[PDB]
Write a protein that binds this ligand. Structure first.
Ligand SMILES: CCCCCCCCCCCCC/C=C/[C@H](O)[C@H](N)CO
Ligand SMILES: CCCCCCCCCCCCC/C=C/[C@H](O)[C@H](N)CO
Lengths: 297, 245, 48, 97, 245, 49, 245, 297
């Protein structure tokens, strides 16, 4: 039991989060109210102190004579579902016959949705995002031709054996999930849960995963979060022999049940690499367009 | 009533007569880890006054040709006082912070600094300039400590992201004709309830001049910027030998 | 000890130097005990 | 509150009023040292000038908290920030801030 | 609300826009002599407005090489106005005082003055320097009047007592970057209920620079110090011819 | 500059505990400080001199 | 029910199957400092699990020709773990202890050790042998640390006091045919509520063979004695730089 | 406020001292009760385990057939008052005319009662002792002759100026306490309080008072407690000239209102120094007498 007064009157162990703000409903845009003229002293709503770090609480009712406007413009399309529940390209796998890419008939793809700029810049608006997903696989020939071929889409989680071939033993999918499809069918579409050991994925990780000295050898590890390495996507031509059709598998991901935290500045520079916020330092481009002078247009 | 402030935590006390206000980050004050959010079962140590107190790191000089500086948290306190021993002796760490930046100048001085908190401030590099080399930053750039590091390209924050949208995070301004202190209170921000203090840095602290310092020949040309910061609601768990990195 | 935190910044026309006057006292919890005679002031003999 | 003679360097009669105020000037911004003194009232040093340090001569044991008040006697336009650190015992003279 | 003050007593009025506060001496406001404390049986005259009013003595210049000045009360008003006639025509005297000291300077000026009230400020001398001569001060040093007298050794206040412990009496500071007036209200302090105004001086008024005046070449170098004082609750008893000393 | 002393306590400058003081102010009174016999005079009564 | 014991404090746990009992010193369990006994006003840090835990110092060998060993508290933990950092970073210290001594041997081994706690175990010296030299012990004999020091004359305990009356303090015996552990729980014992851990040692811990070890040629001749000790109700106050001595 | 469960269910701040024992009244010795014969199993009160570190709880009622004895022997003479409230020599000051000891007519004595073995071995039975005292000064000539002389016994606390002479300015005793006595009078006898900044004096101090390096120079500081340095005793011949009688002042201290803590082993070796538990290591004497053999007497 607690006897001394500094321990009885202590705020240690206050687990309850003390919040200043509260979320209120805003199904529509705020309505404008009627305003008249103001000719007094002391009350000066146009003057702010931006050094506070807050934003201006000035409205148009206090800057001009306004009318009543009953707004019925909905804020429903700015939600995170409506902004992210839109399938976009996150992956592309090529299965050729001759060449170097994948000349054996199988292809493993380390899952990362940071290889296509248009979906990456949408997620990197936040640093933490938690969601369930819906992946869709659009398979076709280079020319776009639909051909009579069977494939197997195996999810290889981390730790499970990756297939070293088409005739491999990992393809028996006794415990790993798999999808068999013909190219003549609609694209395969499966729903995936939130599968992180953490409470949210994170597109930016300011740190190293491992302890120890950090020399130039193990500097690749900077930024790598194992909580986002969700495993491997594998694909093959179901068969003991060589296929006759070249193939491409394109992967489209749609988020659902989205939560996000901590918005960030948006990428203005061209991406260069996967899971690396590097940029071209010689060819730094300004965020927008330029002028000849500041007094013109 | 709002330009004066006294910040007392521990055995430490800051006065300011020319303040703006206090920024409480994301409208959350720092707190302790609840039993629902917790997963580790060891009892954490909660040293109230020996680690939750104001620490003063160093002093950067605001010159005309300045570009900016960043500091990474909690790397700034991993070699300092009792905090940087509990953090080395333990494996897990949880804390908020109160950052407080000081820059004094006269009434005949002009300039502005953006003082901002950027979570998970991952550091990119110029990639050889051409963008072909997949270069990486060394350890003395991602965890630079209390000395901080000088921004090479502060327009993109050395991460390809514009400085102009950085007010979407926490921030204050130090406008020398209005204020000389900038006080931000940051909670613990991570996907996990605890994490390592030596491997992972939760956020960065940017100090960038948007408006450049100017004065006429005769005034005090040394305008220092001093970083002063206090942990809040600190918690440590998982005790073993002291390792530094 | 007294340390410079930032600097002593002054504009042009004002003097580059100032002075600080320290003033020392005791608090409401202060007590003294065991009255004696003082040591840090002494008298050369032959008064008047 | 009585005046604490921190700058107890001068001894000649010409400059004995200099013992009641100590200087603060423009530095290079390296966290430099202005002044250092002991928090001991009965010890032969700055506190001898105080009414506390003279009525403590007539007593053998003291207890309780002290109070040191510094006043800035510069221009209205002069600015500055200073760190005034009390170092409890065991702690030697700090070499830096 | 506290930096502004108007002091109205009699036909006189002082304004100040840059004040500190008013010091009420020993927590006693001036009062009149009670019938229990009184011993003399004559009826005293109590002229309300003709002697209780602000009198302005003279103006001392604060130079760089200043040492200090003292004035003795009520000797400063024994040749001035209606007070200095009732005091000469009578034998007994009782009054408080409101002292008010004025020193104006710019915001580019720095310096401090200790303005203190020392009861029974007996004036010693250097004793020949060697301490063998039993010298004595002349009359134009113990009762110097409205002109005041310049301290020779202000460290010991020309009495062998340290200036540093002088805040144990009444005092204010005139810090030029904070205030330009110093207002002290003194009651009658003596072992007796009345006393002579010409023979006995109740207290002294010290004005000493602790911090020296400094300014750069171009500013107003004449920084005057002006003493302005008002009797309070005055009382005179025992009427006979007018004697000056 | 007001001429008063600081009304600042240690409860407002540091995080403090409860201390129940039982230190007496009885030895600082003017009786206890002055009710102590000391030399005020010395008279010599010699034979020659 | 009495020969088995598990001592759990912190992240640490000792088992024993061949115990006697636990000695609670002077019938007082360790406690925290009350507000009546306290004089210092700073808030003390009370790190529950990071300093109150079992620490293992070293291992002394019980040979035939042994004389005894002593260890001084808290000097044994001033360079060890989080305790020896809070103790260096702070000026004040208060704690109890649970000492636990280990010596294992067979059933064909015989011997006895007196394991005792001597408060304020001041170390004297032989005084030149003749008693004329006023010699003094060096620092590596009064504060010998975790290595401990070998008694020169254990009859008088190197202090002129007889070993035979040492059962008047806390003690246990390790009789190898009965027990192999000795557990003593010591409260904070001092005239003051707190004190320095580096300058002052509260008590000593003596391990002396009264009966000598004996075994026949073929048995395990290495019979180690291991000291294992846990702070209890620790408290630290007065924070400044880390000083070691 | 406290929210987490480890903080609500915490014993941190338990200032109350948990005691196992309780002091009961024992004004007399314990009475003996009647006992008979015992011839059972299991109950064996003669067998102990001394390894526990406790003392035997065996009584004579369980070892022999005993009678009833109604004891009326009082334990009143073993108290700490009755054991210590007995004046003994703690100091001796010599004031000769010619020689080296004190040839000027004044003598300062640093107060320590550890210079006489018979009172020292009584106090060093404990490590902490708190008491008020009663000092008594028996002044006389070397021969024991009482002579017509006036003296002044000044208590010089720590910090106060010590007198450098007989004509000194410290002797004015304006604030230090003093006693004037003629040798023809009864011995001066004054009562003294507990004057330590601590809660008890301490005869043993395992530590150093000062921080810093501890080399062979400042090794005298080992064992020195400033809480026991209670100051200085000073004595003079009241006069401007030289006295005609040699003198000795002997000091006798009687404790009253005694409290003691933590008993220790008693000194068996001859003391050698003041506030130093040194011993002669070559001539170590056993605690008692010896025999020719163990089977004889
Ligand atoms: C036939 C079954 C196929 C199912 C495959 C679904 C894979 C599930 C993964 C979805 C989660 C993706 C999250 C990715 C995060 C980022 O790429 C990482 N932070 C890497 O930068
Ligand atoms: C005329 C006034 C004379 C009065 C002088 C009385 C002195 C009071 C001192 C009494 C306390 C003695 C305690 C001494 C303790 C030991 O000597 C120290 N621990 C030194 O070893």
């Amino acid at each position: 039991g607690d006897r001394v007064a500094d321990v009885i009157e202590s705020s240690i162990g206050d687990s309850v989060s003390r919040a200043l703000t509260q979320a209120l409903p805003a199904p529509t845009g705020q309505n404008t109210q009627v305003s008249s003229h103001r000719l007094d002293t002391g009350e000066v709503p146009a003057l702010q102190a931006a050094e506070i770090g807050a934003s201006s609480n000035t409205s148009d009712e206090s800057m001009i004579e306004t009318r009543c406007v009953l707004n019925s413009h909905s804020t429903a399309e700015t939600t995170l579902d409506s902004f992210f529940s839109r399938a976009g390209l996150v992956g592309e796998i090529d299965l050729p016959l001759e060449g170097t890419t994948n000349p054996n008939g199988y292809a493993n793809w380390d899952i990362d949705i940071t290889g296509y700029a248009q979906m990456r810049r949408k997620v990197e608006l936040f640093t933490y995002m938690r969601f369930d997903a819906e992946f869709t696989f659009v398979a076709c020939t280079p020319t776009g031709q639909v051909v009579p071929q069977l494939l197997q889409y195996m999810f290889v989680p981390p730790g499970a054996p990756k297939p070293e071939s088409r005739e491999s033993l990992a393809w028996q999918t006794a415990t790993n999930p798999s999808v068999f499809v013909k190219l003549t069918d609609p694209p395969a579409q499966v729903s995936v849960p939130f599968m992180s050991p953490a409470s949210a994925y994170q597109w930016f990780y300011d740190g190293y995963p491992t302890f120890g000295e950090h020399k130039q050898e193990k500097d690749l590890e900077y930024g790598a979060c194992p909580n986002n390495m969700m495993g491997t996507f594998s694909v093959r031509t179901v068969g003991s022999s060589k296929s006759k059709y070249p193939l491409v598998v394109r992967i489209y991901m749609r988020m659902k049940h989205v939560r996000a935290w901590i918005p960030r500045p948006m990428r203005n520079q061209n991406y260069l690499f996967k899971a690396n916020p590097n940029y071209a330092g010689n060819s730094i481009k300004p965020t927008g367009t330029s002028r000849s002078a500041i007094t013109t247009l | 009533s709002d330009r004066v402030a006294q910040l007392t935590i521990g055995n430490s006390t800051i006065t300011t007569q020319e303040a703006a206000n206090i920024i409480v980050g994301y409208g959350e004050w720092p707190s302790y880890c609840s039993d629902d959010d917790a997963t580790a079962v060891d009892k954490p140590t909660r040293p109230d006054v020996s680690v939750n107190r104001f620490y003063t790191l160093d002093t950067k000089l605001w010159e005309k040709s300045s570009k900016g500086w960043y500091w990474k948290f909690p790397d700034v306190l991993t070699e300092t006082g009792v905090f940087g021993q509990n953090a080395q002796f333990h494996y897990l760490y949880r804390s908020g912070f109160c950052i407080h930046v000081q820059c004094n100048a006269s009434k005949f001085h002009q300039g502005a600094l953006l003082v901002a908190i950027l979570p998970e401030y991952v550091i990119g590099t110029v990639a050889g300039g051409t963008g072909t080399e997949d270069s990486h930053p060394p350890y003395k750039q991602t965890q630079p400590g209390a000395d901080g590091f000088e921004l090479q390209h502060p327009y993109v924050l050395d991460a390809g992201i514009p400085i102009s949208q950085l007010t979407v995070c926490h921030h204050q301004r130090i406008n020398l004709r209005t204020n000389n202190c900038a006080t931000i209170i940051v909670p613990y921000m991570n996907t996990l309830p605890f994490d390592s203090a030596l491997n992972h840095c939760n956020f960065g602290l940017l100090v960038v001049p948007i408006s450049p310092l100017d004065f006429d020949q005769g005034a005090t040309p040394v305008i220092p910027i001093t970083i002063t910061l206090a942990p809040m609601c600190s918690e440590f768990a998982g005790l073993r030998q002291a390792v530094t990195q | 000890s007294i340390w410079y935190q930032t600097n002593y910044v002054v504009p042009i026309g004002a003097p580059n130097t100032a002075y600080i006057i320290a003033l020392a006292a005791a608090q409401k919890n202060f007590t003294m005990k065991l009255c004696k005679d003082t040591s840090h002031i002494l008298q050369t003999a032959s008064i008047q | 509150e009585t005046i604490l003679e921190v700058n107890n360097v001068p001894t000649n009669a010409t400059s004995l009023m200099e013992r009641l105020r100590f200087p603060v000037s423009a530095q290079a911004g390296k966290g430099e040292l202005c002044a250092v003194f002991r928090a001991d009232p009965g010890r032969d040093g700055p506190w001898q000038s105080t009414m506390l340090g003279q009525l403590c001569g007539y007593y053998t044991q003291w207890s309780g908290s002290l109070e040191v008040t510094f006043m800035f006697t510069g221009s209205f336009m002069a600015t500055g920030k200073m760190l005034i650190a009390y170092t409890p015992p065991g702690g030697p003279l700090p070499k830096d801030r």
